[PDB]
UniProtKB/Swiss-Prot annotation:
Binding residue positions for Ca(2+) 3: 70-71, 73, 75, 93, 96
Boundaries of the shown chain within the full protein: 106 to 264 of 470
Family: Belongs to the peptidase M10A family.
Binding of Zn(2+) 2, residues: 113, 117, 123
Gene behind the chain: MMP12
Domain notes: The conserved cysteine present in the cysteine-switch motif binds the catalytic zinc ion, thus inhibiting the enzyme. The dissociation of the cysteine from the zinc ion upon the activation-peptide release activates the enzyme.
Induction details: By exposure to bacterial lipopolysaccharides (LPS). Inhibited by dexamethasone.
Known role: May be involved in tissue injury and remodeling. Has significant elastolytic activity. Can accept large and small amino acids at the P1' site, but has a preference for leucine. Aromatic or hydrophobic residues are preferred at the P1 site, with small hydrophobic residues (preferably alanine) occupying P3.
Compartment(s) where it occurs, according to its Swiss-Prot or TrEMBL record: Secreted, Extracellular space, Extracellular matrix
UniProt-annotated binding residues for Zn(2+) 1: 63, 65, 78, 91
Name used for this protein in its record: Macrophage metalloelastase
Binding, Ca(2+) 1: 19, 94, 96
Gene source species: Homo sapiens (Human)
Catalytic residues of the enzyme: 114
Length: 159
């Protein structure tokens, strides 16, 4: 339902999981945003200080937003749809072991999914869609949004 009422969107990574190298975390997030900017008019800018539309945070259990994480497994992360304050923010359960590839929960793939929510997309029934409600691992270098994912994000932002 909610949508960002602009095309220039900013994000900021509040903290970094010790699971990965700082650079790998920044890259995974940057790449996830580009997945969406590539098929819409949306342009994402990363800020290292100041307010951002989308705040990326790694945390375990209760972290202040009333939706406490649940330990290893189960919910891996969560995000809030477009809106002020908490709206748009993407949180990742530190109790998961974040990885660049298959050695655990893939940050890149998870981020693409969560940012979809940050942009206003809900869950699809299409098993091929990244917005499908259940996590799935695939070779990150050959990852591609499904036609359903594209249709959904373009009906919201065009292009
Ligand atoms: C080719 C790769 O395909 C993939 C497809 C799906 C996923 C994937 C990644 C993470 C998760 C989760 O951690 C579960 C998490 C649950 C909470 N959660 C939300 O934040 C949310 C926002 C908007 C609508 C519904 C929900 C919702 O149920 C949630 O649904 O965000 C679930 C699925 C990862 C990769
Ligand atoms: Ca969890
Ligand atoms: Ca926000
Ligand atoms: Ca961790
Ligand atoms: Zn949270
Ligand atoms: Zn989801």
């Amino acid at each position: 339902g909610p949508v960002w009422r602009k095309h220039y969107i900013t994000y900021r990574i509040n903290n970094y999981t010790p699971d990965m190298n700082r650079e790998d975390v920044d890259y995974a997030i940057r790449k996830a945003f580009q997945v969406w900017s590539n098929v819409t008019p949306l342009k994402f800018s990363k800020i290292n200080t100041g307010m951002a539309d989308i705040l990326v945070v790694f945390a375990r259990g209760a972290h202040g937003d009333f939706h406490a994480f649940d330990g290893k497994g189960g919910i891996l992360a969560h995000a809030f749809g477009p809106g002020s304050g908490i709206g748009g923010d993407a949180h990742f359960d530190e109790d998961e072991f974040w990885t660049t590839h298959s050695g655990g929960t893939n940050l890149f793939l998870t981020a693409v999914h969560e940012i979809g929510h940050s942009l206003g997309l809900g869950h699809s029934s299409d098993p091929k869609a990244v917005m499908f409600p259940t996590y799935k691992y695939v070779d990150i270098n050959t990852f591609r949004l499904s036609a359903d994912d594209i249709r959904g994000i373009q009906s919201l932002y065009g292009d």
